[PDB]
Amino acid sequence: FVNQHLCGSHLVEALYLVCGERGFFYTXK
Amino acid sequence: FVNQHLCGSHLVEALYLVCGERGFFYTXK
Amino acid sequence: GIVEQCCTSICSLYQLENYCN
Amino acid sequence: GIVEQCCTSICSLYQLENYCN
Ligand code: NA
Ligand code: NA
């Protein structure tokens, strides 16, 4: 699911799934 | 959509929608 | 943290915006 | 940033994990 173009909610979802209990930061534009 | 219990992907989604171009940080547990 | 405030208790816009950059 | 690497170009696990805390 990670090896594609991921934008918007799709990208946030991938971060959520990959990072798990670590959490993540999303900083766009 | 924000005034409820929000867990996991549901919480990430709310952050995404609310924060917009600002982005956000998700740090759980 | 955010889980305590928004997942195991009811979330708020006020609280969510504290996690925007 | 992440948009340039994962949205307008093809994302990778390698890149995504750089944004985990
Ligand atoms: Na997985
Ligand atoms: Na909205």
Curated annotation (Swiss-Prot), chains A, B:
Quote the annotated effect of H10D.
In HPRI; Providence
- Consequence when changing F24S: In HPRI; Los-Angeles
Its recorded name reads Insulin B chain
Protein's organism: Homo sapiens
The taxonomy runs: Eukaryota, Metazoa, Chordata, Craniata, Vertebrata
Span of the full-length protein shown? 25 to 53 of 110
